[PDB]
Amino acid sequence: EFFGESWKKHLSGEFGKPYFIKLMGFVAEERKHYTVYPPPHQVFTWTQMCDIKDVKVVILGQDPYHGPNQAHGLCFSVQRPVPPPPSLENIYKELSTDIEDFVHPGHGDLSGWAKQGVLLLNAVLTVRAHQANSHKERGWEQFTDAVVSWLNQNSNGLVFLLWGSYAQKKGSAIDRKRHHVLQTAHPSPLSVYRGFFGCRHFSKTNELLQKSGKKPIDWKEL
Numbered sequence: 001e002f003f004g005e006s007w008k009k010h011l012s013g014e015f016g017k018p019y020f021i022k023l024m025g026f027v028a029e030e031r032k033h034y035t036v037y038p039p040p041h042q043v044f045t046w047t048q049m050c051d052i053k054d055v056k057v058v059i060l061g062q063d064p065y066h067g068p069n070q071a072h073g074l075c076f077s078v079q080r081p082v083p084p085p086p087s088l089e090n091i092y093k094e095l096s097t098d099i100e101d102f103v104h105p106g107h108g109d110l111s112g113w114a115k116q117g118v119l120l121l122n123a124v125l126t127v128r129a130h131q132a133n134s135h136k137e138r139g140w141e142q143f144t145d146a147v148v149s150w151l152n153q154n155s156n157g158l159v160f161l162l163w164g165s166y167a168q169k170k171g172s173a174i175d176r177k178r179h180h181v182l183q184t185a186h187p188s189p190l191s192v193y194r195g196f197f198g199c200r201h202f203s204k205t206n207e208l209l210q211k212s213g214k215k216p217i218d219w220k221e222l
Protein backbone atom coordinates (compact mmCIF):
# COMPACT_ATOMS: atom_id res chain seq x y z
CA GLU A 1 0.00 0.00 0.00
CA PHE A 2 2.73 2.47 1.02
CA PHE A 3 5.65 1.23 -1.11
CA GLY A 4 5.81 2.43 -4.75
CA GLU A 5 5.51 -0.37 -7.31
CA SER A 6 8.58 0.41 -9.46
CA TRP A 7 10.76 0.58 -6.34
CA LYS A 8 9.16 -2.58 -4.93
CA LYS A 9 9.97 -4.43 -8.17
CA HIS A 10 13.70 -3.76 -7.79
CA LEU A 11 14.12 -3.71 -3.99
CA SER A 12 11.84 -6.56 -2.86
CA GLY A 13 14.85 -8.92 -2.92
CA GLU A 14 15.69 -7.35 0.44
CA PHE A 15 12.34 -8.03 2.09
CA GLY A 16 12.74 -11.73 2.93
CA LYS A 17 16.29 -11.31 4.28
CA PRO A 18 16.74 -12.00 8.02
CA TYR A 19 17.81 -8.38 8.77
CA PHE A 20 14.68 -7.01 7.08
CA ILE A 21 12.15 -9.20 8.91
CA LYS A 22 13.95 -8.38 12.17
CA LEU A 23 13.83 -4.65 11.31
CA MET A 24 10.09 -4.80 10.59
CA GLY A 25 9.53 -6.50 13.98
CA PHE A 26 11.64 -3.89 15.76
CA VAL A 27 9.72 -0.92 14.30
CA ALA A 28 6.35 -2.60 14.95
CA GLU A 29 7.28 -3.19 18.59
CA GLU A 30 8.52 0.42 18.92
CA ARG A 31 5.21 1.75 17.55
CA LYS A 32 3.38 -0.20 20.28
CA HIS A 33 5.19 1.54 23.16
CA TYR A 34 6.34 4.85 21.65
CA THR A 35 5.48 7.53 19.12
CA VAL A 36 7.59 6.75 16.05
CA TYR A 37 8.16 9.15 13.14
CA PRO A 38 7.29 9.30 10.37
CA PRO A 39 3.79 7.73 10.48
CA PRO A 40 3.57 4.24 8.89
CA HIS A 41 2.08 5.57 5.62
CA GLN A 42 5.02 7.99 5.13
CA VAL A 43 8.06 5.80 5.89
CA PHE A 44 8.42 5.19 2.13
CA THR A 45 7.28 8.52 0.66
CA TRP A 46 10.58 8.58 -1.26
CA THR A 47 9.25 5.60 -3.29
CA GLN A 48 5.96 7.40 -4.04
CA MET A 49 7.04 10.63 -5.74
CA CYS A 50 8.68 9.34 -8.93
CA ASP A 51 9.35 6.08 -10.73
CA ILE A 52 12.72 4.55 -9.75
CA LYS A 53 13.77 4.80 -13.44
CA ASP A 54 13.24 8.58 -13.30
CA VAL A 55 15.70 9.33 -10.47
CA LYS A 56 18.21 12.02 -11.54
CA VAL A 57 19.74 13.30 -8.29
CA VAL A 58 20.32 11.62 -4.91
CA ILE A 59 20.62 13.54 -1.65
CA LEU A 60 21.66 11.29 1.24
CA GLY A 61 20.50 12.03 4.77
CA GLN A 62 21.03 10.39 8.13
CA ASP A 63 18.16 10.37 10.67
CA PRO A 64 14.52 11.49 10.17
CA TYR A 65 13.37 14.63 12.01
CA HIS A 66 12.27 13.59 15.49
CA GLY A 67 9.81 16.40 16.26
CA PRO A 68 6.03 16.25 15.90
CA ASN A 69 4.71 16.80 12.35
CA GLN A 70 8.21 17.14 10.86
CA ALA A 71 9.32 13.88 9.19
CA HIS A 72 7.22 12.69 6.25
CA GLY A 73 9.55 10.29 4.43
CA LEU A 74 11.78 12.69 2.48
CA CYS A 75 15.11 13.81 3.93
CA PHE A 76 15.21 17.51 5.05
CA SER A 77 11.56 18.11 4.04
CA VAL A 78 8.68 19.28 6.27
CA GLN A 79 5.06 19.51 5.08
CA ARG A 80 3.00 22.72 5.37
CA PRO A 81 2.54 24.49 7.77
CA VAL A 82 5.65 23.25 9.62
CA PRO A 83 8.47 25.83 9.57
CA PRO A 84 11.61 24.70 7.70
CA PRO A 85 14.19 23.53 10.31
CA PRO A 86 17.61 25.31 10.48
CA SER A 87 19.32 22.91 8.02
CA LEU A 88 16.57 23.48 5.45
CA GLU A 89 16.71 27.27 5.93
CA ASN A 90 20.44 27.03 5.12
CA ILE A 91 19.68 24.92 2.03
CA TYR A 92 17.23 27.66 0.91
CA LYS A 93 19.81 30.36 1.71
CA GLU A 94 22.41 28.67 -0.51
CA LEU A 95 19.77 28.25 -3.24
CA SER A 96 18.92 31.97 -3.11
CA THR A 97 22.49 32.90 -4.12
CA ASP A 98 23.25 29.89 -6.33
CA ILE A 99 20.01 29.94 -8.36
CA GLU A 100 19.34 33.58 -9.28
CA ASP A 101 15.54 33.47 -9.44
CA PHE A 102 15.09 31.12 -6.50
CA VAL A 103 13.17 32.73 -3.65
CA HIS A 104 12.18 31.14 -0.32
CA PRO A 105 8.92 29.24 -1.13
CA GLY A 106 7.48 30.06 2.34
CA HIS A 107 7.27 26.37 3.31
CA GLY A 108 9.60 23.36 3.71
CA ASP A 109 7.88 20.72 1.54
CA LEU A 110 10.42 19.29 -0.92
CA SER A 111 7.83 17.12 -2.72
CA GLY A 112 8.25 19.28 -5.86
CA TRP A 113 11.90 18.19 -6.04
CA ALA A 114 11.09 14.52 -5.35
CA LYS A 115 8.58 14.54 -8.24
CA GLN A 116 11.38 15.76 -10.55
CA GLY A 117 13.54 12.75 -9.65
CA VAL A 118 15.50 14.23 -6.75
CA LEU A 119 15.73 11.25 -4.37
CA LEU A 120 15.64 12.52 -0.78
CA LEU A 121 16.81 9.41 1.06
CA ASN A 122 17.53 9.16 4.79
CA ALA A 123 19.86 6.29 5.79
CA VAL A 124 17.65 5.46 8.79
CA LEU A 125 13.93 5.66 7.99
CA THR A 126 12.31 5.77 11.46
CA VAL A 127 13.01 7.45 14.81
CA ARG A 128 11.45 7.46 18.27
CA ALA A 129 9.84 10.85 19.02
CA HIS A 130 12.32 13.36 20.54
CA GLN A 131 15.18 10.85 20.49
CA ALA A 132 17.70 11.46 17.70
CA ASN A 133 19.42 8.27 16.42
CA SER A 134 17.12 6.00 18.49
CA HIS A 135 16.59 3.57 15.58
CA LYS A 136 20.21 3.62 14.42
CA GLU A 137 21.81 0.25 13.51
CA ARG A 138 18.54 -1.71 13.65
CA GLY A 139 18.49 -2.72 9.98
CA TRP A 140 17.67 0.48 8.05
CA GLU A 141 21.29 1.14 7.09
CA GLN A 142 21.52 -2.18 5.24
CA PHE A 143 18.24 -1.52 3.43
CA THR A 144 19.19 2.00 2.34
CA ASP A 145 22.68 0.72 1.36
CA ALA A 146 20.77 -1.71 -0.90
CA VAL A 147 18.91 1.24 -2.44
CA VAL A 148 22.11 3.22 -3.09
CA SER A 149 23.81 0.11 -4.50
CA TRP A 150 20.90 -0.54 -6.86
CA LEU A 151 20.99 3.04 -8.18
CA ASN A 152 24.78 2.85 -8.52
CA GLN A 153 24.56 -0.37 -10.55
CA ASN A 154 21.37 0.23 -12.56
CA SER A 155 21.10 3.95 -13.24
CA ASN A 156 23.22 6.23 -15.39
CA GLY A 157 24.77 9.68 -14.88
CA LEU A 158 23.15 10.31 -11.50
CA VAL A 159 24.27 13.30 -9.45
CA PHE A 160 24.89 12.32 -5.80
CA LEU A 161 24.95 15.21 -3.31
CA LEU A 162 26.84 14.16 -0.19
CA TRP A 163 26.60 16.65 2.67
CA GLY A 164 28.56 15.79 5.83
CA SER A 165 30.88 12.90 6.66
CA TYR A 166 28.01 10.44 7.29
CA ALA A 167 26.52 10.91 3.81
CA GLN A 168 30.02 10.87 2.29
CA LYS A 169 30.82 7.47 3.80
CA LYS A 170 27.43 6.13 2.64
CA GLY A 171 28.26 7.26 -0.91
CA SER A 172 31.93 6.20 -0.88
CA ALA A 173 31.53 3.20 -3.22
CA ILE A 174 29.61 5.02 -5.99
CA ASP A 175 31.12 4.68 -9.51
CA ARG A 176 32.63 8.15 -10.11
CA LYS A 177 32.80 7.63 -13.89
CA ARG A 178 29.25 6.35 -14.40
CA HIS A 179 27.85 8.87 -11.88
CA HIS A 180 28.73 12.35 -10.60
CA VAL A 181 29.49 12.93 -6.93
CA LEU A 182 29.46 16.31 -5.18
CA GLN A 183 30.68 16.59 -1.59
CA THR A 184 30.59 19.36 1.01
CA ALA A 185 29.82 20.10 4.67
CA HIS A 186 26.43 19.39 6.25
CA PRO A 187 24.01 22.37 6.02
CA SER A 188 23.42 22.31 9.81
CA PRO A 189 24.24 25.68 11.45
CA LEU A 190 27.22 24.06 13.24
CA SER A 191 28.90 23.03 9.97
CA VAL A 192 27.29 25.16 7.21
CA TYR A 193 30.22 27.61 7.03
CA ARG A 194 32.70 24.75 6.65
CA GLY A 195 31.90 24.51 2.95
CA PHE A 196 28.15 24.27 2.40
CA PHE A 197 27.65 28.02 2.02
CA GLY A 198 29.16 28.79 -1.40
CA CYS A 199 29.18 25.13 -2.50
CA ARG A 200 26.88 26.00 -5.46
CA HIS A 201 25.76 22.33 -5.61
CA PHE A 202 22.39 23.16 -7.16
CA SER A 203 23.63 24.99 -10.27
CA LYS A 204 26.49 22.45 -10.54
CA THR A 205 23.98 19.57 -10.43
CA ASN A 206 22.15 20.96 -13.46
CA GLU A 207 25.43 21.35 -15.42
CA LEU A 208 26.33 17.72 -14.68
CA LEU A 209 22.81 16.59 -15.65
CA GLN A 210 23.22 18.29 -19.04
CA LYS A 211 26.52 16.41 -19.48
CA SER A 212 24.54 13.23 -18.71
CA GLY A 213 22.11 14.16 -21.51
CA LYS A 214 19.35 15.02 -19.05
CA LYS A 215 17.07 18.00 -18.46
CA PRO A 216 17.82 20.05 -15.32
CA ILE A 217 15.98 20.17 -12.02
CA ASP A 218 13.89 23.30 -11.55
CA TRP A 219 14.89 24.01 -7.93
CA LYS A 220 12.12 26.64 -7.72
CA GLU A 221 9.44 24.04 -8.48
CA LEU A 222 8.22 23.57 -4.92
Ligand SMILES: O=C(O)c1cccc(CNCCCO/N=C/c2cc(=O)[nH]c(=O)[nH]2)c1
Pocket (backbone or CB within 6 Å): 060, 061, 062, 063, 064, 065, 074, 075, 076, 077, 085, 086, 087, 088, 089, 122, 186, 187, 188, 189, 190, 191, 192
Ligand atom coordinates in the same frame (compact mmCIF):
# COMPACT_ATOMS: atom_id res chain seq x y z
O1 LIG B 1 18.84 26.49 12.42
C1 LIG B 1 19.68 27.12 13.00
O2 LIG B 1 19.52 28.41 13.33
C2 LIG B 1 20.95 26.50 13.39
C3 LIG B 1 21.92 27.23 14.07
C4 LIG B 1 23.11 26.62 14.43
C5 LIG B 1 23.34 25.29 14.11
C6 LIG B 1 22.38 24.55 13.42
C7 LIG B 1 22.61 23.11 13.06
N1 LIG B 1 22.80 22.96 11.62
C8 LIG B 1 22.65 21.60 11.11
C9 LIG B 1 21.18 21.23 10.84
C10 LIG B 1 21.02 19.83 10.26
O3 LIG B 1 19.66 19.58 10.03
N2 LIG B 1 19.17 18.11 9.95
C11 LIG B 1 18.26 17.85 9.12
C12 LIG B 1 18.09 16.48 8.58
C13 LIG B 1 16.82 16.03 8.23
C14 LIG B 1 16.68 14.74 7.73
O4 LIG B 1 15.55 14.30 7.40
N3 LIG B 1 17.76 13.96 7.59
C15 LIG B 1 18.97 14.41 7.93
O5 LIG B 1 19.96 13.66 7.79
N4 LIG B 1 19.15 15.66 8.42
C16 LIG B 1 21.19 25.17 13.07
